[PDB]
Amino acid sequence: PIVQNLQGQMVHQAISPRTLNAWVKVVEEKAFSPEVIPMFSALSCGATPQDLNEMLNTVGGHQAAMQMLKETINEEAAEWDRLHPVHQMREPRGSDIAGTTSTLQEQIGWMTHNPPIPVGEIYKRWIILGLNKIVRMYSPTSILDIRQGPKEPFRDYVDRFYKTLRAEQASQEVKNAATETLLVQNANPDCKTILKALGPGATLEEMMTACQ
Amino acid sequence: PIVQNLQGQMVHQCISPRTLNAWVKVVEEKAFSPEVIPMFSELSEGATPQDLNTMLNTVGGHQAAMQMLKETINEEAAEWDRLHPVHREPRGSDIAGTTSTLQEQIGWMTHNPPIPVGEIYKRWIILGLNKIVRMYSPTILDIRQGPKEPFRDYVDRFYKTLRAEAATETLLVQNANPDCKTILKALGPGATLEEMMTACQ
Numbered sequence: 001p002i003v004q005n006l007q008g009q010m011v012h013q014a015i016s017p018r019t020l021n022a023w024v025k026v027v028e029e030k031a032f033s034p035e036v037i038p039m040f041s042a043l044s045c046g047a048t049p050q051d052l053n054e055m056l057n058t059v060g061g062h063q064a065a066m067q068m069l070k071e072t073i074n075e076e077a078a079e080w081d082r083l084h085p086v087h088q089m090r091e092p093r094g095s096d097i098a099g100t101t102s103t104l105q106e107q108i109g110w111m112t113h114n115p116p117i118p119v120g121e122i123y124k125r126w127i128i129l130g131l132n133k134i135v136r137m138y139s140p141t142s143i144l145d146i147r148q149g150p151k152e153p154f155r156d157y158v159d160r161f162y163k164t165l166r167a168e169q170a171s172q173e174v175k176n177a178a179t180e181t182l183l184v185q186n187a188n189p190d191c192k193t194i195l196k197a198l199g200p201g202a203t204l205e206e207m208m209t210a211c212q
Numbered sequence: 213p214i215v216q217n218l219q220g221q222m223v224h225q226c227i228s229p230r231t232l233n234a235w236v237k238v239v240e241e242k243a244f245s246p247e248v249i250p251m252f253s254e255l256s257e258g259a260t261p262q263d264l265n266t267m268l269n270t271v272g273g274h275q276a277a278m279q280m281l282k283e284t285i286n287e288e289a290a291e292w293d294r295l296h297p298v299h300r301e302p303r304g305s306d307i308a309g310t311t312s313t314l315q316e317q318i319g320w321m322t323h324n325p326p327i328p329v330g331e332i333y334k335r336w337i338i339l340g341l342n343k344i345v346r347m348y349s350p351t352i353l354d355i356r357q358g359p360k361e362p363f364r365d366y367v368d369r370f371y372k373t374l375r376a377e378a379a380t381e382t383l384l385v386q387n388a389n390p391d392c393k394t395i396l397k398a399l400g401p402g403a404t405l406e407e408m409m410t411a412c413q
Contacts, residue, residue: 001226022229035272042266045226155276162275172269175279204280205343 001046002108010112012104015051019043024058032065032138034166037131041124048107049099049123056127065134072130073098080122089113097123132170139167143179148188154211157187158204187211213258214318222322224314227263231255235267240360244277244348245369249341253334260317261309261333268337277344284340285333292332307333352377357389363412367405388412 003013023043030036044055059066077094086093089109096102097119110117146164148157161183165174184195191211195202198210215225235255242248256264271278289304296303302320306312307329320327355373357366366388374380385396392412396403399411 016229019229022233030272033272035270038266038269039232042227042232042270043229046224158276158279159274162279163273166275172278173282175282204276204283205347208276208280208347 001048001051002112010108012048012050012108015047015054020055020058023055024060027059027062031062032131032135034135034172037128037135037171040131041128044124046120047124048104048111048120049097049102050104050107052120052123052127053099065138068134068137069127069130072133073126076126076129092117092119098126099123135167136170139164139169142168143182144186147186148191150188154187154191155208158183158208161186213263214260214321222318224260224318227259227266232266232270236270236272239271239274241358241362242365243274243358243361244341244344245365246345249338249345252341253338256334258330259334260314260321260330261307261312262314262317264330264333264337265309277348280344280347281337281340284343285336288336288339302327302329308336309333352380352383356387357392359389361389363388363392364409367409 001013001015002010005011023040026036026039026043040055044052047055056066056069077098080094080097084091084093089106092102092106092110096106099107102119107119110119141164143161143165146157146161148154162174165179166172184192187195194210195207198206202210213225213227214222216222235252238248238251238255242251252267256267259267268278268281285308286304289308292304292307302312306316309317309329312329317329320329350373352370352373355366355370357363367384370380370384370387385393388396395411396408399407403411
């Protein structure tokens with residue numbers, strides 16, 4: 001990230017071995033589970049593009065996924081160039097934000113300018129866009145296949161439903177009319193009848209309590 | 213969280229890897245035991261709404277609970293909007309950090325007078341966590357050791373539940389998880405609690 005030195009100059013603070021190891025381990029242990037995306041974002045708080053590239057490079061497996069990610073990154077960089085024609089410092093182009101044609105010092109200059117040109121945050125946005133695609137792709141189930149079954153508690157079924165909906169779906173804000181109705185429809189008849197009796201506008205709190 | 217520069221300016225202090233991991237681990241190990249509430253509040257000291265969202269979003273399992281929490285949050289945001297008509301002032305989703313930027317949140321939180329959006333949002337979150345603790349409250353037959361719950365924490369819950377409600381201790385062993393159960397069974401009958409806890413330490 002960025003830090004200020006004894007001479008007052010803004011300089012790079014190298015990313016920490018604790019952060020690197022935490023990141024490498026999350027990926028080893030959780031692969032492209034949906035919760036890896038918030039985790040990557042938090043671990044990369046205040047990263048320059050160089051730092052972001054450092055983090056992406058430490059992934060050892062998943063080379064197909066990492067290639068797909070490069071593709072998405074190049075697509076966003078091209079869209080940036082399309083929307084930002086080039087006529088303080090010089091203006092960053094797409095590949096500069098992605099850190100492949102920009103120097104660390106230039107990145108620091110952009111990020112710490114007044115007003116700041118947040119190339120670290122812009123690049124992170126592109127990366128998470130690509131990561132989300134991968135999370136979606138690696139989801140092996142369709143919400144539809146999540147049905148309650150025989151002697152599974154309602155709570156466990158809701159757990160699986162929203163876990164799956166976080167995967168085959170981009171992110172965690174889900175909960176449409178569609179999803180509530182699907183949620184009820186895929187419960188077993190006992191619960192379904194209880195929930196239907198609840199009337200529309202039932203909270204998930206009320207739904208879980210009723211079926212407890 | 214938030215910190216001031218020597219140049220006077222309020223800036224963001226990134227949430228630490230140690231804090232992030234501690235949170236994720238507490239949830240993995242303790243599920244929705246009541247002591248999750250104090251611990252969350254400690255871990256989130258001085259948090260901006262962005263940080264609070266980071267903490268909630270890094271939770272991977274327990275998606276029923278996390279969905280309920282979103283529901284409670286949206287309810288409090290709507291109640292905020294009901295009591296704070298807008299004529300800048302933060303709206304509900306701004307306090308919940310979904311429609312406000314970090315810089316805006318920092319501005320509100322460090323203004324004079326402060327609009328403590330971090331504290332307001334934390335209040336909503338703990339309200340929702342409390343609902344979950346209440347929901348997952350087992351009333352003794354429904355106290356069974358969790359997958360990755362430390363044995364000590366499980367025994368705490370077991371005797372706390374017995375408190376609210378070889379007889380109970382039989383059930384204690386029976387309701388322990390497979391890994392610990394194997395260890396305890398090998399211990400032989402008449403093992404003291406100290407011995408059991410050391411064994412599964």
